[PDB]
Design an enzyme around this catalytic site. Structure first.
Site, PDB file in Angstrom:
ATOM      1  N   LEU A 133       0.834  -1.206   0.000  1.00 54.14           N
ATOM      2  CA  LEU A 133       0.000   0.000   0.000  1.00 54.14           C
ATOM      3  C   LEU A 133       0.868   1.255   0.000  1.00 54.14           C
ATOM      4  O   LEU A 133       0.493   2.271  -0.570  1.00 54.14           O
ATOM      5  CB  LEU A 133      -0.929   0.015   1.238  1.00 54.14           C
ATOM      6  N   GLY A 142       7.808   4.336   3.374  1.00 50.51           N
ATOM      7  CA  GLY A 142       8.445   5.613   3.684  1.00 50.51           C
ATOM      8  C   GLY A 142       9.089   5.581   5.051  1.00 50.51           C
ATOM      9  O   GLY A 142       9.491   4.505   5.522  1.00 50.51           O
ATOM     10  N   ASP A 145       3.433  13.935  14.644  1.00 47.05           N
ATOM     11  CA  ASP A 145       3.540  13.987  13.182  1.00 47.05           C
ATOM     12  C   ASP A 145       2.175  14.106  12.530  1.00 47.05           C
ATOM     13  O   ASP A 145       1.860  13.426  11.558  1.00 47.05           O
ATOM     14  CB  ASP A 145       4.369  12.804  12.649  1.00 47.05           C
TER      15      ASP A 145
END
Ligand SMILES: NCCc1c[nH]c2ccc(Cl)cc12
Ligand SMILES: [Cl-]
EC number: 2.7.11.1
Length: 273
Positions: A12, A15, A135
């Site tokens: 999917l 990173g 984040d």
């Protein structure tokens, strides 16, 4: 083991967070996401109520795991010789907010209000569970397209919430506050409000307001799209240079721009279906 318990589907994404695959739990066909995180990439380690050595991400996910659907649910985890494997719930159909904004451009304010409200509720849930995400950004928000419900993901840069200063940061620099850029110091809640200001600008403008450290420090907000005065006021308030000039979560949610929010199902019916 894990290999027999789950049927691996396609990748999917990958990173800073690791590699995430689509999957199906073999026992009840439940849709899952299978996240692989290399051990050499885990700097923050913690321990469960029992005392097992696991990534901080696993500690934080367990602290926020509940019935509340605003945060991704950790279903299970496994340790491999060189990695940790996390089994996460997977909404279907799903799209992350970065891909959503990329495809559709700047969001109508009614849609941004519904999405922003849900992010605020999810962040309040994290803080109430003693978790600071660190984040918050479009890439770390999933949209459950059928239900119109948003979910925070990627707790890999997070920390236990504390009332003292943070002097470490490994989240996204363009969402980080001026006090971090200038002094390498921030407090959890006011830094989270700054990132929420960046996120709201991104929703209504289709891009982030600042690219360079000099722009973050100056904090001058220019609107490249037509945005209502109330929305602009709220953004500029979240983006106050002084952390003490920023609104609390209560002040954001009581803001005139935040009134008459749609329910998630109404949001899906009008904007997503
Ligand atoms: N583009 C987002 C990739 C990603 C990171 N963590 C996830 C958890 C669940 C699902 Cl469905 C996807 C992800
Ligand atoms: Cl995740």
């Amino acid at each position: 083991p894990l290999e027999s318990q789950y049927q691996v589907g396609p990748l999917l994404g990958s990173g800073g967070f690791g590699s995430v695959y689509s999957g199906i739990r073999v026992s009840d066909n439940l849709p899952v996401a299978i996240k692989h995180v290399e051990k050499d990439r885990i700097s923050d380690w913690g321990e469960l109520p029992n005392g097992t050595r696991v990534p901080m991400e696993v500690v934080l996910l367990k602290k926020v795991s509940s019935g509340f659907s605003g945060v991704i649910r950790l279903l299970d985890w496994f340790e491999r010789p060189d990695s940790f494997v996390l089994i996460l719930e997977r909404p279907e159909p799903v799209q992350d907010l970065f891909d959503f904004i990329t495809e559709r451009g700047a969001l109508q304010e009614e849609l941004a209000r519904s999405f922003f409200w849900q992010v605020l509720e999810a962040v309040r849930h994290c803080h109430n569970c003693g978790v600071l995400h660190r984040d918050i950004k479009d890439e770390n928000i999933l949209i459950d397209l059928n239900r119109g419900e948003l979910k925070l993901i990627d707790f890999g840069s997070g920390a236990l919430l504390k009332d003292t200063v943070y002097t470490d940061f490994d989240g996204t620099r363009v969402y980080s506050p001026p006090e971090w850029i200038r002094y390498h110091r921030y407090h959890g809640r006011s830094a989270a409000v700054w990132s929420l200001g960046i996120l709201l600008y991104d929703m209504v403008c289709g891009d982030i307001p600042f690219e360079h450290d000099e722009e973050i420090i100056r904090g001058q907000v220019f609107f490249r799209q037509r945005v209502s005065s109330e929305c602009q006021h709220l953004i500029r308030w979240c983006l106050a240079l002084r952390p003490s000039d920023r609104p609390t979560f209560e002040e954001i949610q009581n803001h005139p721009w935040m009134q008459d929010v749609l329910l998630p199902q109404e949001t899906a019916e009008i904007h997503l279906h």
